[PDB]
C-alpha cells in the first residue's frame, strides 16, 4: 500500500471516530495520518499542487489533533 494511500486510510477512519465521539481514537489516527502524508511528499514525488494539498490538509489534521488533545488533557 502506498504511503499516501495509508495516510488517507488512517485519516478517513480518524474522521469516523471523531463523529463517533472518539476524540482519543480519532486523535491517534489524525497524528498517524499526518505522519504518512508528510512522508509521502518527502519520500514520494508529486506535483506542486499535490504537495500544497498535503501541506494544507496536514496542517488541518494536526490542528484538529491539537485541539482534541488540548481539551482532552
Amino acid at each position: 500500500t502506498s504511503t499516501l494511500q495509508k495516510a488517507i486510510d488512517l485519516v478517513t477512519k480518524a474522521t469516523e471516530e471523531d463523529k463517533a465521539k472518539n476524540y482519543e481514537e480519532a486523535l491517534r489516527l489524525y497524528q498517524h495520518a499526518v505522519e504518512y502524508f508528510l512522508h509521502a511528499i518527502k519520500y514520494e514525488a508529486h506535483s506542486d499542487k499535490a504537495k500544497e494539498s498535503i501541506r494544507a490538509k496536514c496542517v488541518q489534521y494536526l490542528d484538529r489533533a491539537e485541539k482534541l488533545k488540548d481539551y482532552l488533557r
Binding site: 508529486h46 490538509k57 488541518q60 484538529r64 482534541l68 481539551y71
Partner: peptide, 12 residues
C-alpha cells in the same frame, strides 16, 4: 489527488 475534510463537530 482527492483528500477528505475533517468533520466540523461541536466539540469543546
Amino acid at each position: 489527488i482527492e483528500l477528505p475534510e475533517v468533520p466540523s463537530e461541536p466539540l469543546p
